[PDB]
Design a protein around this ligand. Structure first.
Ligand SMILES: C[C@H](C(=O)O)c1ccc2c(c1)[nH]c1ccc(Cl)cc12
Ligand SMILES: C[C@H](C(=O)O)c1ccc2c(c1)[nH]c1ccc(Cl)cc12
Ligand SMILES: *C(=O)NC1CCCCC1
Ligand SMILES: *C(=O)NC1CCCCC1
Ligand SMILES: [Cl-]
Lengths: 544, 543
């Protein structure tokens, strides 16, 4: 535990970030000089579908779209620190973008863990600094074959096991709505950047909420597909081979139609031939565009994380609008939530007591946004056990988590994997007994204060459940925190009254004006229906 | 502590006996009322023409059902393939959806497909008297398509075996030759279908278990990608093991029957009964394509020396495919020994066999399992020491033994990641040669009863494709000639270990037995695997 390697890694990373920003700015200046007459705010505020259509007609050139968004990104980065790297070869890709690509001319931002040839994917960890990828990951190759132009890497919290957004290399990303707030994570850089208008489309990943937290905290749309709907080939992570709780990747954008367009672009022959392990399910457009009324299961609370007044209102309003539009709304709650989170989800993420994950931290600083996670994982199994016994009568949530963070044998992992498998069937059976099409749930919100997500773990209950179940789940911004909702946080107690409830209460205060989302869920492989429902919520709640 | 196990065998034996009595009484009544039915003509109809006549009304479902029931009862006399008669099937028979793609087709089920009110014992006494509360998903889908599941077929005890005997229902025999294994673990299906007792069956395959019995018994079989079909309600020994992928699929007399079965199963009913299965419908245009293929092939995997019959089968098919206009490209997946001894074995036994062993507490161990149970029971440190001792002389045994030790969750994660990088590695190696499909030997001809369990090395041709989770199927293409049999005198093996020695003896005295090749396509590519299989069948067995 000396820190000289970690300091040198930060110095190099900060230099590279600084020089990327300088290059971006030079390129933007050069462009703006050659084109002082371009209506840049008209271009930036076009919805993606309309941007794509003008690109396709020739009305906007790719260059103008690209450098206009580049300047916007450089500008919003000043207040958010969301961009870790400029993807330097993107000006060449711009000139070779295939004219028939579904995303021809579209600049796209990429969460830092998407391998991009020539660039680190540090995950904010010093051991990955100075080790550039030697190829584009598969989805990046597909984006490029669809004529998209990936142009920046966006920040993530250290090792990505977090829903905040700071690391010791690139520092802290900020919510563009309010700089005291987290932009969510681990796809926080994408949320910050997309939520301020600096990118029309990005890709994130999500193993416990990491597409959905930043999309909700920053006021944009996001979808986490079924884990094996899209290729994971070439994604950087901290731990490999953990398959109990399913990692997924997916789009973040300003509206639902953008998510659909991106999935449609990715789910093409190129993807399925580049990674044959992905079932070749094309995008089922007729499901996405369907207009039939739905049977919509819903819940207003999971009884685990007390929803904020603004979350609860967002959900009840959406429900009511969905009723009025003719959908049938049916109360529904997945069975045994506390078991799913405390045993299955926590147990699957940390089946080896965190040993693999800890290896990444050897000799490194631990970013304060992770709170006491590293400290606690380092405890020897017997002491976790003892502490878990001692906390059980006082703080049972904490005790259950702690016990599930213990290493175990492969025999016990199989047993866990089999329980995950039975649990997924138990929820599908509830769903089919009620004959649901989709499921409406609250989504954690408004944005928590910086540095509190790592100290409020129970609050992952709304999202992580669908990584456990491996169901597609998306979020759509539906309202903003009113002063009335905010004042009502003084009455919030949580269901448990433990440290997690106490932190969450304080962290959600001061949020007037912040966006608040609901989550839309469908069955495995039903991304298009999930999106069809999202589009409906978006239309109903935010018609204009 | 075997008294409970004895009781379980007595009860299972009485259920099997009653089942067979029930079947015979129903068959005799039917034959009496239909003395003129041409029962040979019906039994010899390819499944596709049988389906056609059922769909038109030309044959009634009753006629087809009782004729197969009678044939199943008779071939069972010589094979012991049937464990149970699925009693309510006569009622299913009457309500069978007239529009289903399988309307009126009798279908046999390996015993591990749960059927309401029936045990799936897997030959184990702890599962006797534990009847299932409902039909598993694929059985529900088969009935919704108008098929009539009618028997459960035998499997080796626990199913972790490619022979076919257990202490409840006893031993299943190859129908071509009664001293030969029918293969397994889907051996009851191989014996039943390979003798004309059933036109379509479902088996399961974690290391070759659809492919061994189809090859040994001279029928076709397809192991799809592991998650192409629903595994919901399948009975198993060990649950939660997901490194090496279990797959389920059809067995039948011809390729077209496999394709018709896959196409019936891949329908909205399956996709909504089990939403965890990607809803990929059967792509008929892929299956019916007639474009020339780039076909990779090997004659040996350099791990298990092929029998002369296997080698000849492989070369002959290769030559035919060349003469029909396909490009044949030497190709051998890289690092097979690692895939077998480290990935496959470690994947199947990551816990040192602890969970598997719990099924055997208090039970007999069928002889067809060999010393598997004895070896898994050894302390980890002892497995390690023997491994170290065996290594300079017998590296295969040593590597397997080492991989059957219990390991930690952390190490299983590392194994799971190695399996996934190995899979990307072979896929990369396949695309660099621009292969459409791959042709390989398939183990055969059938081994002597009670030798599969002592010749584990012989799993190398099949389990590789469970490890990689590629669709793979088998097609009978030739029969052993007196020349192929005599050349077994010269059989050496690459290792000269005890597995080479057992296998050499086990494959002799086989003149006249069927021998297959194996066809492989990339993941999710069942329709192309089948097109390729249909081509092999058409070129090698034209009439
Ligand atoms: C007690 C400690 C804390 O809340 O400070 C703690 C306990 C559990 C977790 C954590 C931090 N940070 C986490 C992140 C993910 C998961 Cl699954 C569990 C935890
Ligand atoms: C030593 C003993 C034998 O050769 O009979 C043995 C050793 C390994 C295995 C086996 C039997 N039976 C098996 C079945 C599957 C696997 Cl992966 C390994 C084995
Ligand atoms: C992204 O999915 N972030 C997750 C937050 C909860 C624990 C795992 C990581
Ligand atoms: C069927 O898949 N049987 C397998 C044979 C080899 C050992 C695993 C079980
Ligand atoms: Cl899958």
């Amino acid at each position: 535990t000396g820190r000289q390697k970690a300091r040198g890694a930060a110095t190099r990373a900060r230099q590279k970030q600084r020089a990327s920003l300088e290059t971006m700015d030079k390129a933007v200046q050069r462009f703006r000089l050659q084109n002082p007459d371009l209506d840049s705010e008209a271009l930036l505020t076009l919805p993606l579908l309309q941007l794509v259509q003008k690109l396709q007609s020739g009305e906007l050139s790719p260059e103008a779209v690209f450098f206009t968004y580049l300047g916007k990104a450089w500008e919003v980065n000043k207040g958010t620190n969301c961009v870790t790297s400029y993807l330097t070869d993107c000006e060449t890709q711009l000139s070779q973008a295939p004219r028939q690509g579904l995303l021809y001319g579209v600049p796209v931002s990429l969460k830092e863990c998407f391998s991009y040839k020539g660039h680190d994917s540090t995950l904010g960890l010093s051991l990955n600094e100075g080790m550039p990828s030697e190829s584009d990951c598969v989805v990046v190759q597909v984006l490029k074959l669809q004529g998209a132009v990936p142009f920046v890497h966006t920040n993530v919290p250290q090792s990505m096991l977090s829903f905040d957004c700071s690391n010791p290399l690139f520092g802290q990303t900020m919510n563009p709505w309010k700089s005291s707030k987290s932009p969510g994570g681990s796809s926080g850089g994408e949320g910050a950047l997309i939520g301020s208008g600096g990118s029309p489309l990005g890709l994130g990943t999500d193993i416990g909420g990491s597409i959905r937290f930043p999309s909700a905290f920053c006021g944009i749309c996001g979808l986490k597909p079924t884990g094996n709907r899209l290729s994971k080939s070439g994604l950087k992570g901290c731990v490999y081979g953990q398959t109990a709780v399913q990692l997924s990747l997916g789009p973040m954008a300003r509206d639902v139609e953008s998510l659909a367009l991106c999935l449609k672009a990715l789910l093409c022959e190129h993807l399925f031939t580049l990674d044959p392990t992905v079932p070749p399910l094309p995008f089922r457009e007729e499901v996405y565009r369907s207009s039939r009324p739905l049977r919509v299961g819903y819940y207003e609370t999971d009884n685990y994380t007390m929803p904020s007044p603004a979350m609860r209102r967002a959900l009840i309003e959406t429900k009511q609008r969905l009723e009025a539009a003719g959908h049938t709304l049916i109360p529904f709650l997945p069975n045994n939530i506390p078991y799913a989170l405390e045993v299955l989800s926590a147990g699957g993420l940390f089946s080896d007591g965190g040993r693999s994950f800890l290896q990444n931290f050897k000799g490194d600083f631990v970013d304060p946004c992770l709170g006491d996670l590293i400290l606690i994982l380092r405890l020897p199994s017997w002491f976790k056990r003892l502490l878990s016994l001692l906390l059980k009568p006082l703080f049972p949530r904490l005790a259950a988590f702690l016990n599930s963070m213990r290493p175990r044998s492969a025999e016990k992992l199989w047993k866990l994997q089999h329980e995950i498998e039975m649990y997924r069937q138990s929820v599908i059976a509830q769903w089919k007994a009620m004959n649901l099409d989709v499921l409406l749930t609250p989504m954690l919100g408004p944005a928590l204060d910086l540095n509190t997500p790592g100290r409020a773990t129970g609050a992952i209950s709304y999202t992580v459940l669908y990584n456990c179940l491996d169901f597609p789940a998306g979020v759509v911004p539906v309202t903003t925190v009113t002063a009335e909702d905010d004042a009502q946080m003084e009455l919030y107690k949580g269901y448990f009254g433990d440290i997690w409830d106490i932190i969450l209460k304080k962290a959600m205060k001061n949020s007037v004006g912040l966006p608040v989302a609901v989550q839309c869920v469908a069955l495995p492989w039903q991304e298009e229906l999930c999106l069809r429902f999202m589009r409906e919520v978006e239309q109903l709640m935010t018609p204009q």
